């Protein structure tokens, strides 16, 4: 039960590193939705030269 307790603690600590590395990549998807708003700033720039 202590070899087993050393196993499931390591697997849960590895899963804890997942759940906080996923969130720092969810905070990266919140930047890819700004690379969207910059690709729409290129739509608005080609629409500025359109309108002008």
């Amino acid at each position: 039960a202590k070899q087993e307790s050393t196993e499931y603690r390591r697997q849960v600590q590895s899963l804890t590193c997942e759940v906080d590395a996923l969130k720092g990549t969810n905070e990266s998807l919140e930047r890819q939705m700004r690379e969207m708003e910059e690709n729409f700033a290129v739509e608005a720039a080609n629409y500025q030269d359109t309108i002008g």
């Binding site: 720039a45 500025q48 030269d49 002008g52």
Partner: peptide
């Protein structure tokens, strides 16, 4: 119109 276009393309 060209210069302000190239400033927004920049």
């Amino acid at each position: 119109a060209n210069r302000n276009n190239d400033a927004l393309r920049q």
